[PDB]
C-alpha cells in the first residue's frame, strides 16, 4: 500500500526543464515535509523517486533527512551518489533500483519491520509507473490554481475532474486555500474508491425525540466555500416552505453567518462561474453613487434591467422614473446620505453624507474608532427606490497587525444567485479599502437576515452541491502606486488570478 | 455498588407539600425521569428506590413503576401490603420492602446481582439524607424547577448546592436549554461526585492543528448562556489589545454571532444579576421615542446620566444641549426618522419616519415581506447626537407557525456590562412586538460588531466564568387584553418569574 504526493497545475502539468514550473511554494513544501515524515513511534518513512526528480534536488537537502531515500534508476550506480556527498550519521544510504515494482521488493525483502507509510515522491515515469500497477491507496494532491508552462506531466486518471472540468479516485479532504509568491494552491488527499459520560448519555436520548448534504464523501473539509455549501443544504434540509412579493415559492432560515479570508487568496465561489465583471463593474457604480442602471446595462452587465423596466417602476408605484432609474439607491447613499434625489442625471455633488469618505478618513487617521460604518438603508427614502437594499449594511474594523477586516449584513439572501455575488462583491470593496487606507485585508464576515432558496432553482442546487470546490483565485490591484484614493479605481486595475470554476450553472432572476 | 440519585428541585432544595408535588405537572420532566430510570444496554433492568410516602404520593396507574424493580423502604409496610394494593402484571418485577437504604442496598447485592443493571434512589428526603450520608451516590439527575413553591419536604443540603441558589464534591458535568410547562421554568443538571482508512486523512491534520476556559468542568454545554460565557472565553484567549477612544485598554474581535430561544424561557442572563429594571425603563423610553435621560435618571436608572453630563456633552461639542437630552437618540429615529430634531421637550409627534409602526403594520398584514426593519443609524444625524447608537438595527421575521424571530445587529458591543442587557433588551422587545401582532415568540440572534471586554474586567470576567449558569426565568406580560398597541404597555405590566442569578460583580461605566 503506497500514497502519491504531488503538486499539480489545473492542466495536470509538474516539471520543466528538470525543475519546478512555479515560484517556491513554502507552504507546499513545509506539507511535504510533514506528510513525508511524521507517524504516529519505532519507524522511519520512504520516499521513492526516479533518477531525473533526485538530480533536480539542491544538493543540500539531499538524501531528504528522516526518510529512506530510494531512487529508481538503470543508470546511476549506488556509489555515484554516495561519492556525490559524505553521509551524516543516522540516516540510511540512498538506494537505486531497477523499476518501481523492484522498488517495492526491496521494502519487502529488507525493510519490512522498519519502514511505516510508502511515498512516491516523482516524477511521470514513477508515477505513470504507480497508477498503472494500482498499489497507491491514496494521493495527496496540491493543486496549484494558476496555470504554469510545463514540459512533464501527472498522467490522468478517473476522477481529475477535481483539477479542471472535463477504479476511481474521489477526494476525501479539501484544505483551505492557501498562497505563496501570488500563486495560490490548496491540499487534497484521494482515495482509491471503486462511567464518566455512560451518565450523561440517556438524558441525551430522550432529548431529540423528533436529508441532504454538500459532498458526503469529504469528510476533512478545510475549504471555505463549504461553508455557501453546507448553507444551502442547511436551508433545504432545515428551512420553512414560504409565499412572497414575487410569488415564487420560497425556502427560508433566519440568521445566517459565514466568513472568508482575505490574507491569502479571494473567495470567487468555484462551485459554479462567478459573474466576476458583474461583481467588479457593479461595485464601481456603487462607488461613483451612479443610480443610473443603464452604464451597466450598456457595459454586457445586465442584472438590474428587469427591476429597473418601464412596467417595474410602474408597479413600484413610480410613473415619473425614468427606465434605468434605481432610485436613491446603494451607491447614491453611500456617497450621499440624505441629499434630495431628483433624477439619475442630476449632480448630486457635495450634498448628503458621503460615509464612504468618511470611512476611510476614519480608518486612515483613528482605526480604533467603533463608529466606522456605511449603509444603504434610509427609511427617508426607501419608496423613492425602485428596489430597497438587500446588502444595507457594513462595518470595518482593524487589529493590531494593521490588518483589515469588514462586516456586511444583508436582510434578504437568494442563496443560489445573489450571495455568492454578495461575497465576492464586497470582498473586493474590503480589498480595494484596505489598499486604499495601507492596511492588509484579513476577513470578510457575512451576516444574513432572510436567507432563502428559491423553490426553481432547487434542482440546479443538488446539482452544485454534488460539485467540490476548487482553490480560491487571487484578485491582484494592478498600478497599487497610481490608485491613492478609493474613486481612484478602474476596471483595468484588477486580475483575477488562477481561477478554476466548474461549468456554468443558469438560474433565473426572480422579477 | 454506586447509587444515582433522580431529584427534581426548588431553589431553596425544595421537594414536596401535602404528600405530593409543589409544582403544576411538568411533562418534560416526567419523560425525562420515565427514560433514565427505564433506558438499559439484553438480558439486563433498572432498580427504583424510595420511600414510603414517595410510594403513597404516587398516582396508582403508575405505582408500580412499569420495566423498573420498585424498592420502598419503610417499617410500617410490609411487602403484602403492597401486593394487595394491586394485581402484578405478568412479566414485571415484584416490589421489595427494606427497613433501611443499607437493606435495600444489601438486598440488591445478596439476590439481584446479575440482574439489575443500575439503581436509582427515587425519593424522598429520608432516603436522599441516608444515601448522601453513606456516599454511595456518583451522580445526581437534578431537575432545577426555577420557581419557587409552597414546599414541606427539602432535599438535603450538599456540597456542590451552588448551583441551585446562591451561598467530597458534587460538580456539574452536564447543564441542558431551559424548559417550561405550565409557566414554569426548569432545567437539567447532572452532577458527579469529584472530591489508514481515516487514518490517512490525519497527517494533513497534525500540521494544520494546534487558555481561559469556562466552567471547564460542564461535558455538556445546552444551556444557551455558555454561548455569552464562551464568548466572553474567545476575547481574551484570542482578541488583540486595542486602545480606545475612552484611553482604557480593550480586548476586542470581530463578527461574533448569539442566538438565544424565547419560546420556552427569557435570556435573562443568570451567571451575573442583570438590572431589569433598567432594561424595561430603557426600551419603553425608547418606545416612547424620548430623548431624554431624566426621566430615566429620576426612576431610579442612572445608565445614561454618565452621557448626559454638561463636561460629556460639551466634549461631544454639544454646548446648548440640557442635560439629559441624548440629542436624537434611538428612541427618536425609531419613531421619526429623518425628522429634525430640537430639544428633548419639543414634541415630534408625526415627523420623520415611524419604522416601529411601519414594522407592527407590516407584521400584522404582510409576514413574509422581508423589509421588516428598524434603524437607529442616521450618517447625517451623528453630530448631534450625545453617542452613536450601539445597537442601530433590528430585522423581524415571521415563520409558517406565526412565530417570530428578530436579529439585532450591534457595532459595538460591551461583553462585561452591555451584552447581556442588550442580549435582555431586544428579546424583551420581540415578546412585546409578538404579543401586539398575535404571534409566538421563537427566538432572538444578536449580530455583533466590534465585540470586546474592558481590561478593567478581565480580573472580573475571570472570576464570572467559575459560575456555571442557572436555568432562565419566563417574563410573562401582565393584562394581555389591556395592551393591543406597542405604546399600550407600561412598566407594571411585566413579571419576571423564576430568575435566580448569582451574585453581582461591580463593573464600571465607561464614558
Ligand atoms: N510537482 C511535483 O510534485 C514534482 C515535480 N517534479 C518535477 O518532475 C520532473 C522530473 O520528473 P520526470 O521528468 O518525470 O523524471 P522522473 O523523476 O520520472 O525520472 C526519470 C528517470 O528515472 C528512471 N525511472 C523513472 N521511473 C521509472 C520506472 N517506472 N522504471 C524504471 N525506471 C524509471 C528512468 O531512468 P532510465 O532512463 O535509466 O530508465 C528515467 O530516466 C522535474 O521537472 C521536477 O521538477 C519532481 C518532484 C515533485
Ligand atoms: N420532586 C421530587 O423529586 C420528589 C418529591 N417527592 C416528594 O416528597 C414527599 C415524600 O417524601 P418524604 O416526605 O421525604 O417521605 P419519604 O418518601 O422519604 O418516605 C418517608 C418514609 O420512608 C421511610 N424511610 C425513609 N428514609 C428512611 C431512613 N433513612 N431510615 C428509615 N426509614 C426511612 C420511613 O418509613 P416508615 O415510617 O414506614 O419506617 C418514612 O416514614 C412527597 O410530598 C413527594 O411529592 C418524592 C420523590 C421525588
Ligand atoms: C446579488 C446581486 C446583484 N444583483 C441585483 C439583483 C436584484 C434583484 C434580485 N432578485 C433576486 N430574487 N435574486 C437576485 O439575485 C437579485 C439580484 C443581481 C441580479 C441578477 C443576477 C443574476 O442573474 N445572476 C448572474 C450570476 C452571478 C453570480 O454568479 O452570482 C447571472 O448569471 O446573470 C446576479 C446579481
Ligand atoms: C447596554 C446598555 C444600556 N446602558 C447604557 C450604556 C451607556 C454607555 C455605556 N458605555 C459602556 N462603555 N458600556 C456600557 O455598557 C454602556 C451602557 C447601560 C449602561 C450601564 C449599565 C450598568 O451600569 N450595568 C447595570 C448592570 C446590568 C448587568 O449586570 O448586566 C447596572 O447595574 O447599572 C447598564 C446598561
Ligand atoms: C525555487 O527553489 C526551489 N524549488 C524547489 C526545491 C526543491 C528541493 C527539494 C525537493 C523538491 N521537490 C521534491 C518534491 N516536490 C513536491 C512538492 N510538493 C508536493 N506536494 N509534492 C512533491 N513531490 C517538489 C520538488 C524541490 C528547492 N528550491
Ligand atoms: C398532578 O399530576 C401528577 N403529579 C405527579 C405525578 C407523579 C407520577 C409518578 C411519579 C411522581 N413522582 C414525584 C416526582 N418524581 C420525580 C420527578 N422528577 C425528578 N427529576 N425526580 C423525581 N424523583 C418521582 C416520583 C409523580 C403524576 N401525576
Ligand atoms: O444583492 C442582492 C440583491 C438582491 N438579492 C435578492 C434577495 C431578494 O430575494 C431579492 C430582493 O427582494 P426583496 O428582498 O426586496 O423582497 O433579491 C440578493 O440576494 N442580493
Ligand atoms: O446599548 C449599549 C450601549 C453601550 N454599549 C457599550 C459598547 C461600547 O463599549 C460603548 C460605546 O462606545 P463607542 O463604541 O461609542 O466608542 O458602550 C453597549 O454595548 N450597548
Given at each position: 500500500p503506497v500514497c502519491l504526493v504531488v503538486a499539480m497545475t489545473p492542466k495536470r502539468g509538474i516539471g520543466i526543464n528538470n525543475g519546478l514550473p512555479w515560484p517556491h511554494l513554502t507552504t507546499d513544501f513545509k506539507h511535504f515535509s510533514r506528510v513525508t515524515k511524521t507517524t504516529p513511534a519505532s519507524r522511519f518513512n520512504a520516499v521513492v523517486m526516479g533518477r531525473k526528480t533526485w538530480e533536480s534536488m539542491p544538493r543540500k537537502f539531499r538524501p531528504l533527512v528522516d526518510r529512506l531515500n530510494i531512487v529508481v534508476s538503470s543508470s546511476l550506480k549506488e556509489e555515484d551518489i554516495a561519492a556525490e556527498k559524505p553521509q551524516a550519521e543516522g540516516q540510511q544510504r540512498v538506494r537505486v533500483c531497477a523499476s518501481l515494482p523492484a522498488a517495492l521488493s526491496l521494502l519487502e525483502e529488507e525493510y519490512k519491520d522498519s519502514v511505516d507509510q510508502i511515498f512516491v515522491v516523482g516524477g511521470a515515469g514513477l508515477y505513470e509507473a504507480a497508477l498503472s500497477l494500482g498499489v497507491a491507496?491514496?494521493?495527496?494532491?496540491?493543486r496549484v490554481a494558476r496555470e504554469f508552462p510545463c514540459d512533464v506531466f501527472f498522467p490522468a486518471f478517473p476522477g481529475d475532474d477535481i483539477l479542471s472540468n472535463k477504479a476511481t479516485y474521489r477526494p476525501i479532504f479539501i484544505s483551505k486555500t492557501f498562497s505563496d509568491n501570488g500563486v495560490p494552491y490548496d491540499f487534497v488527499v484521494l482515495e482509491k474508491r471503486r462511567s464518566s459520560a455512560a451518565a450523561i448519555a440517556p438524558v441525551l436520548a430522550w432529548m431529540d425525540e423528533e436529508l441532504i448534504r454538500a459532498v458526503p464523501h469529504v469528510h476533512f473539509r478545510g475549504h471555505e466555500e463549504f461553508q455557501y455549501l453546507?448553507?444551502?443544504?442547511?436551508?433545504?434540509?432545515?428551512?420553512?416552505?414560504m409565499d412572497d412579493?414575487?410569488?415564487?415559492?420560497?425556502?427560508?432560515?433566519?440568521?445566517?453567518?459565514?466568513?472568508?479570508?482575505?490574507?491569502?487568496?479571494?473567495?470567487?465561489?468555484?462551485?459554479?462561474?462567478?459573474?466576476?465583471?458583474?461583481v467588479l463593474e457593479e461595485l464601481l457604480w456603487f462607488i461613483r453613487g451612479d443610480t443610473n442602471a443603464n452604464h451597466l446595462s450598456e457595459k454586457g452587465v445586465k442584472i438590474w434591467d428587469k427591476n429597473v423596466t418601464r412596467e417595474f417602476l410602474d408597479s413600484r408605484n413610480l410613473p415619473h422614473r425614468e427606465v434605468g432609474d434605481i432610485g436613491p439607491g446603494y451607491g447614491f447613499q453611500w456617497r450621499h446620505f440624505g441629499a434630495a434625489?431628483?433624477?439619475?442625471?442630476?449632480d448630486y455633488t457635495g450634498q448628503g453624507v458621503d460615509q464612504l469618505k468618511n470611512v476611510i478618513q476614519m480608518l486612515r487617521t483613528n482605526p480604533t474608532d467603533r463608529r466606522m460604518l456605511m449603509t444603504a438603508w434610509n427609511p427617508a427614502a426607501l419608496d423613492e427606490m425602485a428596489l430597497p437594499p438587500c446588502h444595507l449594511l457594513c462595518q470595518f474594523y482593524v487589529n493590531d497587525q494593521k490588518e483589515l477586516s469588514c462586516i456586511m449584513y444583508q436582510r434578504s439572501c437568494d442563496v443560489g444567485l445573489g450571495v455568492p455575488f454578495n461575497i465576492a462583491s464586497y470582498s473586493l470593496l474590503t480589498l480595494m479599502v484596505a489598499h486604499?487606507?495601507?492596511?492588509?485585508?484579513?476577513?470578510?464576515?457575512?451576516?444574513?437576515?432572510?436567507?432563502?432558496?428559491?423553490?426553481?432553482?432547487?434542482?440546479?442546487?443538488?446539482?452544485?452541491?454534488?460539485r467540490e470546490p476548487?482553490?480560491?483565485?487571487?484578485?491582484?490591484?494592478?498600478?497599487?502606486?497610481?490608485?491613492?484614493?478609493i474613486d481612484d479605481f478602474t476596471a483595468e486595475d484588477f486580475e483575477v488570478v488562477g481561477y478554476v470554476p466548474h461549468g456554468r450553472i443558469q438560474m433565473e432572476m426572480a422579477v
Amino acid at each position: 500500500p503506497v500514497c502519491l504526493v504531488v503538486a499539480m497545475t489545473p492542466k495536470r502539468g509538474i516539471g520543466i526543464n528538470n525543475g519546478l514550473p512555479w515560484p517556491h511554494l513554502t507552504t507546499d513544501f513545509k506539507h511535504f515535509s510533514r506528510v513525508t515524515k511524521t507517524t504516529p513511534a519505532s519507524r522511519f518513512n520512504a520516499v521513492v523517486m526516479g533518477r531525473k526528480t533526485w538530480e533536480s534536488m539542491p544538493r543540500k537537502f539531499r538524501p531528504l533527512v528522516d526518510r529512506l531515500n530510494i531512487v529508481v534508476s538503470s543508470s546511476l550506480k549506488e556509489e555515484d551518489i554516495a561519492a556525490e556527498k559524505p553521509q551524516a550519521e543516522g540516516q540510511q544510504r540512498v538506494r537505486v533500483c531497477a523499476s518501481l515494482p523492484a522498488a517495492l521488493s526491496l521494502l519487502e525483502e529488507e525493510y519490512k519491520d522498519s519502514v511505516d507509510q510508502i511515498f512516491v515522491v516523482g516524477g511521470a515515469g514513477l508515477y505513470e509507473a504507480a497508477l498503472s500497477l494500482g498499489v497507491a491507496s491514496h494521493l495527496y494532491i496540491t493543486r496549484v490554481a494558476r496555470e504554469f508552462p510545463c514540459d512533464v506531466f501527472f498522467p490522468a486518471f478517473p476522477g481529475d475532474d477535481i483539477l479542471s472540468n472535463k477504479a476511481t479516485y474521489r477526494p476525501i479532504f479539501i484544505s483551505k486555500t492557501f498562497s505563496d509568491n501570488g500563486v495560490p494552491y490548496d491540499f487534497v488527499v484521494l482515495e482509491k474508491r471503486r462511567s464518566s459520560a455512560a451518565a450523561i448519555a440517556p438524558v441525551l436520548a430522550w432529548m431529540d425525540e423528533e436529508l441532504i448534504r454538500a459532498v458526503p464523501h469529504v469528510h476533512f473539509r478545510g475549504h471555505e466555500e463549504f461553508q455557501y455549501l453546507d448553507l444551502i443544504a442547511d436551508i433545504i434540509n432545515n428551512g420553512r416552505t414560504m409565499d412572497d412579493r414575487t410569488g415564487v415559492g420560497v425556502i427560508s432560515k433566519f440568521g445566517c453567518t459565514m466568513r472568508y479570508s482575505l490574507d491569502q487568496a479571494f473567495p470567487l465561489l468555484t462551485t459554479k462561474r462567478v459573474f466576476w465583471k458583474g461583481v467588479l463593474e457593479e461595485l464601481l457604480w456603487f462607488i461613483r453613487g451612479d443610480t443610473n442602471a443603464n452604464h451597466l446595462s450598456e457595459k454586457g452587465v445586465k442584472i438590474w434591467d428587469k427591476n429597473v423596466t418601464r412596467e417595474f417602476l410602474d408597479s413600484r408605484n413610480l410613473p415619473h422614473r425614468e427606465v434605468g432609474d434605481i432610485g436613491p439607491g446603494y451607491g447614491f447613499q453611500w456617497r450621499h446620505f440624505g441629499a434630495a434625489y431628483k433624477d439619475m442625471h442630476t449632480d448630486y455633488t457635495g450634498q448628503g453624507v458621503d460615509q464612504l469618505k468618511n470611512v476611510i478618513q476614519m480608518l486612515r487617521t483613528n482605526p480604533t474608532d467603533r463608529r466606522m460604518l456605511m449603509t444603504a438603508w434610509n427609511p427617508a427614502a426607501l419608496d423613492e427606490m425602485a428596489l430597497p437594499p438587500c446588502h444595507l449594511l457594513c462595518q470595518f474594523y482593524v487589529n493590531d497587525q494593521k490588518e483589515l477586516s469588514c462586516i456586511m449584513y444583508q436582510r434578504s439572501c437568494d442563496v443560489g444567485l445573489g450571495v455568492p455575488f454578495n461575497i465576492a462583491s464586497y470582498s473586493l470593496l474590503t480589498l480595494m479599502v484596505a489598499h486604499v487606507c495601507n492596511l492588509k485585508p484579513k476577513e470578510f464576515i457575512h451576516f444574513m437576515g432572510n436567507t432563502h432558496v428559491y423553490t426553481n432553482h432547487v434542482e440546479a442546487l443538488k446539482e452544485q452541491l454534488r460539485r467540490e470546490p476548487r482553490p480560491f483565485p487571487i484578485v491582484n490591484i494592478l498600478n497599487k502606486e497610481r490608485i491613492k484614493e478609493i474613486d481612484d479605481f478602474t476596471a483595468e486595475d484588477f486580475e483575477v488570478v488562477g481561477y478554476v470554476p466548474h461549468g456554468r450553472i443558469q438560474m433565473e432572476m426572480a422579477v
